[PDB]
Amino acid sequence: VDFVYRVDSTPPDVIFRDGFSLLGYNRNFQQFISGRSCSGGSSDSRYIATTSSVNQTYAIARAYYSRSTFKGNLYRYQIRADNNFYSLLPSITYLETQGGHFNAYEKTMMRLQREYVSTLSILPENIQKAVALVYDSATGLVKDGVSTMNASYLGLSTTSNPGVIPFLPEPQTYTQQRIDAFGPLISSCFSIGSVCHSVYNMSFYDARPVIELILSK
Amino acid sequence: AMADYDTYVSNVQINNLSYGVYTSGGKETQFFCIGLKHGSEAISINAMCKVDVYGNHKQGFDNMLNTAKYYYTTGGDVRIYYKENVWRDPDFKSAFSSRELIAITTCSSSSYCMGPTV
Amino acid sequence: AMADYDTYVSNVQINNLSYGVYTSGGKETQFFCIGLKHGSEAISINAMCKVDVYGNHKQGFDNMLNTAKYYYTTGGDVRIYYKENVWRDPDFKSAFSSRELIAITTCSSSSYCMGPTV
Amino acid sequence: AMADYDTYVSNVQINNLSYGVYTSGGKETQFFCIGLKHGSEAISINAMCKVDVYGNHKQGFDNMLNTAKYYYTTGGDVRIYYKENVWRDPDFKSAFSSRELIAITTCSSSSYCMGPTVTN
Amino acid sequence: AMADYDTYVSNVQINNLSYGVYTSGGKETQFFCIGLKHGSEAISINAMCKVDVYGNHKQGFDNMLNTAKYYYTTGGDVRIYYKENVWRDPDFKSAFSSRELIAITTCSSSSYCMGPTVTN
Amino acid sequence: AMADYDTYVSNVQINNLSYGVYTSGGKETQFFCIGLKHGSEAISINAMCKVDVYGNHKQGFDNMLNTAKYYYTTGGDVRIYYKENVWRDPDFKSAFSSRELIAITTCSSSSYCMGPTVT
Amino acid sequence: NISDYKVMTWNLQGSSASTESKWNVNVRQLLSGTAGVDILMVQEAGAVPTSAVPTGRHIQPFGVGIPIDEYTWNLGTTSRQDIRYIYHSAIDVGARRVNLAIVSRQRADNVYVLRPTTVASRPVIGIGLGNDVFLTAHALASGGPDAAAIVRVTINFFRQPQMRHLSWFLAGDFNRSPDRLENDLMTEHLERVVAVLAPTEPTQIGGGILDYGVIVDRAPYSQRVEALRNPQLASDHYPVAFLARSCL
């Protein structure tokens, strides 16, 4: 994919200066996909989650705007993907050839995310623009407001990495674990607090029971 | 306009659930009940039930049951349509509710939920 | 061309649901309705309903209902096939829609949804 | 006082499930049983069953099965209403339980669960 | 060799799903169709349907639908057994396929799926 | 003891599933089968099935099927009660096995699963 | 960004153990695993491990062209490889043993070699990974009088227009108190351009904080990098790690 997206409440004059920073050093892959190394868990992930879906970012913003206790504005950041951005599936496949097992809840979450992970911090050079998101209290919809183009952006001819994440820890023994989610089955790593900042801290539910319901009866 | 759709409570969450089998009036019933909150606030009208072989509308027991279970899981904002003074069993009324569950619809904002209004 | 498959909206998301029990025309009914949006924007053809004991196709009520619930949960892109001017209950049409839900298919991209086109 | 609702355990979680088919008393049955814990501790009454063609209430087999499975899935706090000394098959009673499952309600706090309570 | 299990594709994924109601040949029907991929590449054998009141095996409509929905949701590797040249409604055939879905089984590895196989 | 509950495998995981429609002995059937493993180990007793209109217990086809799908979803540890030498269709038996699936119970620890045991 | 890597500096000059033992036991300890150190700056390493394998890569460095040798070094087995890259500077001009090395988890895109103006001063070597450059240095033993000049030439090289996009981080044996280096930098009107990152505990056994880091303020999230002494004591110098602080 060429371009991916994140939502943040930090305004463009700050993000275009600093970029996005990793929570920590935790390379564990299934802890990242399940949200356990993200903001609702150990909050030390060595990855930044991005999505290729613009519609998902509308859902992220609605989940924040819909809360009575949330104040402030939200921006969608458009990010050029390069060789440090990985899709999930090749690493899913590779880790399975190491004896790793992902249950149906985790596989379900991963394919819904349309997720590309950055193994490094995301530089302002990769951030092309910011689009303010406007919330309509009467409809609950989120629309595009003012766009701001990043003068520091570099239009390099890169694209996302089609291979496996490097230095992946060898998979741990399988265990059923909570999967943090918010909104319509959005991984918690897409929350604003799942990148390190210079912020409203969304709460998450366990996606497993919800997924179990739509898979059964 | 729509009969039995005149009374509702909007933008609530289902925060409690009850499913049981019970003998009432010489008949073997199933019932379920939902409990409601309004965010962090408790509300007075916060329970309503559905019985499989009693009430104004006996149909839809399984579908309403699973629908209640779903919104209890998601915690999502919903509007509950209910009818008052239905259940006659005085032990059931005091244990649960005298209200019959009519319909459940979602709320896409603090202002709007699907379904008819006054 | 498949009869009743000529009118549809593509790449929408189900962003509202309604399920209820209701007396109409001397029959005890179940119904559900889906609310639609198109990414960021509202659309005019934004509600359509299915009734268990009425409509051009009474079969598949439970299956359609669970399918609607599914895509409401995931928020994924779907194509909605529907039929205009079905429901005759004037209170129902005003509260929900006159449209009967016919089919729901998945969209694997912004370009393609499964099923026939015109 | 709702009949069959005076015996229950509160603020427990379903931590085990059994489902099976079984011949009992010359009839083909289905049954399921739930196992209970109490947070991080065990509980002295921790098993109860439902049979599709036997018991004080034969209705609701599928809905009670689906509901038990749901709370196994969530691990959330429930109250379990049950009836003692119901199953008379001596093999089943010692393999699973003698108790019949009557109702399952949720507990929204450590001190409140939905449904009637006995005052003592 | 089990009858109607001689034709199948292995280690595929269900990446699209259609569910609808439809009058066909004077009968009210329900049907669903699955869309297939093979990892990265598309395949010609990519649409297979089931109809509740038509086909070589009308039983199991709900269970097959739930099964198809399951693997569409997880995106897991499956094997699809199907039967060619079944649906004779020309509008339905042109919109989807003529293949009747017969069975779905799981693929625990790149090289193994559960179910009967044929020699070649 | 409970009849048809004397044969079981404990602390296994369901790692494969089959569901299909099939004509057998002139009757239209549904069936499902479960594949098993024991942690990182393969086990020889690894497939057992249930048929909607055949077997020693024809009841509970959907409930057993949905239960099987659930423990396939979670990969949790289960005990499988089953019965040997039930299915007589030779094409079915060689494709899967002769075993009829009787019950599924959970194992909350490496040493305990729900239900009766034998000595 | 610098904070994305686990960085460490260690001076090998120490006790009775030879350099080979220091590589195969101590350095291995420090780098091993996915949680191991990603970037290790090493001083007074006269030889790379005997396990190391030359790559033959003809490295033509930015700055000045002294011979830098690239090596692969397997920390795992023949079946399960764990390949780290070693960049070693043996000697300068005629004689002058430099004995600087940087060990990296990934192959270097670019290599940098800088010289201060000070007469007998050892060069500064560095490796670029994407937008990040990691450099090491070893100031003169008589009080590190070239320490500020080490930092100065590094600042001035990477403030060139074609280099200003890069984040750089320098760590090594400065042979000078961090406070004294800070005052030198303030004297040279450079205290506001770089941040000195040093542990609170001595880094050589005699006492005194001699091994630490310097980072450009302009590097994004440079304020997250914290200097932390490692407890290891296989030489006269403790290793010093540079690790991102917890976010919150």
Residue numbers in the entry:
A (entry chain G): 19 to 216, 224 to 242
B (entry chain A), C (entry chain D): 22 to 139
D (entry chain B), E (entry chain C): 22 to 141
F (entry chain E): 22 to 140
G (entry chain F): 23 to 270
Paper text:
Typhoid toxin is an A2B5 protein toxin and an important virulence factor for the human-adapted bacterial pathogen Salmonella enterica serovar Typhi, the causative agent of typhoid fever. Typhoid toxin contains two enzymatic subunits, PltA and CdtB, which dock onto a pentameric delivery platform composed of the protein PltB. It was recently reported that the same enzymatic subunits can assemble with a different delivery platform composed of the protein PltC, forming a distinct version of typhoid toxin.
As in the PltB typhoid toxin, CdtB does not directly interact with the delivery platform and is tethered to the toxin primarily through the disulfide bond it forms with PltA. Despite the fact that PltC and PltB share very little sequence identity, their interactions with PltA are strikingly similar. The charge distribution of the PltC and PltB channels is also very different in the upper part of the pore, the main region that interacts with the C-terminal α-helix of PltA; this region is highly positively charged in PltC and is more hydrophobic in PltB. However, a similar experiment wherein purified PltB toxin (CdtB-His6) was mixed with purified PltC-Strep pentamer showed significant displacement of PltB from PltB toxin by PltC at a 10:1 molar ratio.
